[PDB]
Amino acid sequence: KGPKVTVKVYFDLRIGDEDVGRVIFGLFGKTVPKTVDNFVALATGEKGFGYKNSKFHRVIKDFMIQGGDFTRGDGTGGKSIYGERFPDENFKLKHYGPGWVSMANAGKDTNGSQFFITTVKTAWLDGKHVVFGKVLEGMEVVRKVESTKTDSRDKPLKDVIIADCGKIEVEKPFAIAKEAA
Amino acid sequence: QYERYSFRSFPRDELMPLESAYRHALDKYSGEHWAESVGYLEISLRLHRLLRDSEAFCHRNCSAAPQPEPAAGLASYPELRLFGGLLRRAHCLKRCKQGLPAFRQSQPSREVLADFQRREPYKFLQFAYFKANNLPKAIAAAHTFLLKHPDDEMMKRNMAYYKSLPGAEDYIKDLETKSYESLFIRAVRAYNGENWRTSITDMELALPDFFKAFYECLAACEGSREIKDFKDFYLSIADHYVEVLECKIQCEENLTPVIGGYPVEKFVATMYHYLQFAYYKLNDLKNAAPCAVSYLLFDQNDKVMQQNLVYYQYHRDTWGLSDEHFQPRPEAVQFFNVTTLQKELYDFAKENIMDDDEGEVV
Amino acid sequence: GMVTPDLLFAEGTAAYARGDWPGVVLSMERALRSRAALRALRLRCRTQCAADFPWELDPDWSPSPAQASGAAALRDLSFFGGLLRRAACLRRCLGPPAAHSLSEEMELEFRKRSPYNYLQVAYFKINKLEKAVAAAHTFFVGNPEHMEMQQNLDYYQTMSGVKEADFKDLETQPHMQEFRLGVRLYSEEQPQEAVPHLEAALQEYFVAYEECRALCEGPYDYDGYNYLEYNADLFQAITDHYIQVLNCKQNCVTELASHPSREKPFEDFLPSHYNYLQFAYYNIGNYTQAVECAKTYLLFFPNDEVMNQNLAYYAAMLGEEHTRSIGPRESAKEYRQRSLLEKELLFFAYDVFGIPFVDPDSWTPEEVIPKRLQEKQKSERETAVRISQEIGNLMKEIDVSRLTREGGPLLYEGISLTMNSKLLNGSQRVVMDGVISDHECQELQRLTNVAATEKFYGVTVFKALKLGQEGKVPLQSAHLYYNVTEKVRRIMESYFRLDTPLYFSYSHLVCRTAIEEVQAERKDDSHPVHVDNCILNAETLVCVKEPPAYTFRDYSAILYLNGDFDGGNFYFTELDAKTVTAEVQPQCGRAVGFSSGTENPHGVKAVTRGQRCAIALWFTLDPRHSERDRVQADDLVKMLFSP
């Protein structure tokens, strides 16, 4: 058994001035709503501000890649559609392995607009962050950005830019497995 | 591992947290040391048995606590009465659990308890016994583990290897055994040996033991849970009980003895069938009729025993039978009530309360 | 169904920022409507689901011997079957549950009436002045210290198009608008127009009480990240949640009697209702109602002398048979009867489980408080008059605020007084030497170094006790930590001349390490200048006390454990965080104690090449905002060392 996906949002990454590929996410709009609704709204840019032309500001190797802060580039901003912060909904799902998306927070009940794509099984973050997605396709592209040259502050030397980001409708919610990738 | 065990006088030398003892046992097992690992694994088993015995003793006073009659004005507010009784029972439990030596150590995590209920340590125990020239104990541990997991290929290979050795053919014993199962086996042997009084006495001794074990197991299923959602009052205390009920449903089937590799289906019905036959063969119908009525109660759709009951009813003025010796025994009625109520509650709960946001992967 | 209010509020705020007046007015009105719609839906579902499935109580069912194992199971099954039926009804009625929850900032914004400020600005810019003055009056009543809205109301008053009765309040509860108006009419020697208003106030009070009691069945309140270590059984979790719900239901009598125009809730609300009613009825000429109201007031306070005199006068004027014929009102009887049982249950829970409860009523008899709880209240009362006598002697022997609330006994032997408040350039400041010896310095340092496996690690006393129980850290170190925390609490309470008992809020054993690989060009402090009560805004030289900050803390104390490092000095700063006022040098045995208000902004300098070990302690004077982990720690210590 596993959770059911309901929506699919896709990204189009770019390191430097060279196309790399496309990452397609699978979001659980029934297990944890109001967190998918934030991610979907920012992806399509319904309310003006969105993830377009954003940047990944933490490329910590063998741990995770974190991005989504569009207010400023240093990684200490970000606002959601429900004001500024909104509380954690439920910790039903865990970081089962690589390619699982979750909401990065700076305390308790401080969900904003920053996420991170897990790359190794982080069992010590369970019960602290809320997981709302899974990387369905393009698992070889997320590993391209991770192996880029980075300085001491974990900021990549070459900028990573989300060129495009949209949304694909799903006609029939299909379950997935809690294994990896 | 259980010969030198006493719940009251437990040696204070080996009182350690269960998790620490298990960790030391596993660490020494991986370090190619055998005797010390055997001792530590046995100590961990004894600690688990002590923990279960202590938890099954502090639920004896609290449940059997006749509540005092309250004031006159309190009778008009039922919610306050119910939850005041709940607070008093919780207070009694909390006070009682502070006096026992097994509750003053570091309590184990849920995954370790789940592993212990799955009889996992017995694999290590049998291998360590084998590597220490303890073939009878090794085969006993292998058989004990096989009793719970009838689908483990490695255990079949090991057990077949054990049978190949000479002499190791009559030491097949269960390390985790219960009194009622032994009493039932002795009663069955006596009944097959055309002995009636001994069989009747053994069955009548075995029934209350099974009921006591059943109610202790039911009481031991109301444990903690893992917090992952934050709902309202009723909606959150109606999920803890759903998990508790999922645990409770399997207590009846986790206690049934296994004979010949096949669990004896309809345990209580078989007990009452044996009792009815034995009582009838002695022409003591005063006790024979209620056993037949109870067997009807547990198995409604029968053929031969219904015609039996017809014979008893129509010929009631032949041996002497009042209108009261035609009703089931109170214990059978209570058992039927509890089992049917739990099944009905689970059937109702898995349609209106359980969430539907997970499916089957294809 | 109805979209979440916070999304609509965000849309309206954005529209206000851009300058789209129709957008902001539409969004704010939609948000205000949706909040009330959701509240009404919750109330309706809860009331209907409670009315559909009554508890109905268990029958007589004598226990009987030798059959007491299955009877308990049957009783539990009945109780949980009823519970499951009610839960199913609620799950069917409510629907999607994500829309009923919102952050604390949004709730605070809705409590302070900010949409009405936005709406009044928008309505003025839209030329709809009547609604503009209505919104301005609503906001002004919400916040009485706002002078700009008073000026705006005056400007609206100068321009024609309104009246004095045109002003309307759209947020205050109906039972509160009728009480004040009736009281004002009665104070103007006009009893004829005062009685119907007070009667309507009583009716609406009972209705609003029954409505507010049905909204207290909410989620359990874990202490931050303490839901990951929660190991309560079924029947303990049920009682924890029920006790919290009962506390919330009992804390509504102090919410229905509070108005934003005042800084203090009304005293004895319902008995005051009956007192004004009986006075007005006597003034009018109606006498049976007067004696009935006097009796139903003496029901609550049966030892009053003025009301007894009034009742005696009324009875003397009337006949004995009539005065014996009429009694109190039944609604007050039922209200008091239910509240007494709830109070009894809460006092039992406080006595046994150590869950605090502060009585919101003054008419509660002494027969509902247990015997052990009664002695503690007596000792707390005696120490209040002993401290008061000490203060009077100092004043009669005579900067007042620096002599009558400082200079305590310092009970424990071996403690000196290095610097008082005068030498620290401020008020409510102290520095003490030699609270603990060097052996305890080493013990605590090793306890906080072993438990670890700039940087930062802190361990609380409860976690230290649990780790000592498991076997990772020594147990005597945890016991010593417990003892030193209690000793510092007692010393701090005694020095500052406190009469109300001082409770615990938080404790923390911190350890700061400086990494020398990133020591090149570090121009920031280890701890920025802050205030433990407010949240600081140095741009305007003021703080605001809000939920994002722990506003319930009253006193602070810091105890140091070593003195071999570079930097790490503790310094006090004035309101603008640029000028140092005092500085202390860490050595173990030093205790820095101060009040955590806005008069003592502090900070920690940068730590380079060493370790800084210290214990940080914060105390409260409010028994409700106490530490919930100290009861469990005390229970652990009781059963570990004196079992």
Ligand SMILES: *[C@@H]1O[C@H](CO)[C@@H](O)[C@H](O)[C@H]1NC(C)=O
């Ligand atoms: C349970 O413990 C209490 C503790 O005082 C005792 O009074 C009571 O008799 C005990 N119950 C049984 C059945 O022994």
Ligand SMILES: *[C@@H]1O[C@H](CO)[C@@H](O)[C@H](O)[C@H]1NC(C)=O
């Ligand atoms: C218990 O079972 C008997 C017979 O099966 C039935 O008559 C009785 O009503 C049941 N009791 C309850 C409480 O369901």
Ligand SMILES: *[C@@H]1O[C@H](CO)[C@@H](O)[C@H](O)[C@H]1NC(C)=O
């Ligand atoms: C007093 O008031 C009640 C109703 O409030 C009324 O029925 C009664 O007639 C009044 N008594 C007199 C003397 O007016």
Ligand SMILES: *[C@@H]1O[C@H](CO)[C@@H](O)[C@H](O)[C@H]1NC(C)=O
């Ligand atoms: C802590 O104080 C108690 C006094 O109640 C004393 O018995 C105990 O020995 C003390 N522990 C340490 C480590 O000083």
Ligand SMILES: O=C(O)CCC(=O)C(=O)O
């Ligand atoms: O450790 C210190 O000196 C100050 C700590 C403090 O004031 C705080 O934690 O708010």
Ligand SMILES: [Fe+3]
């Ligand atoms: Fe501070």
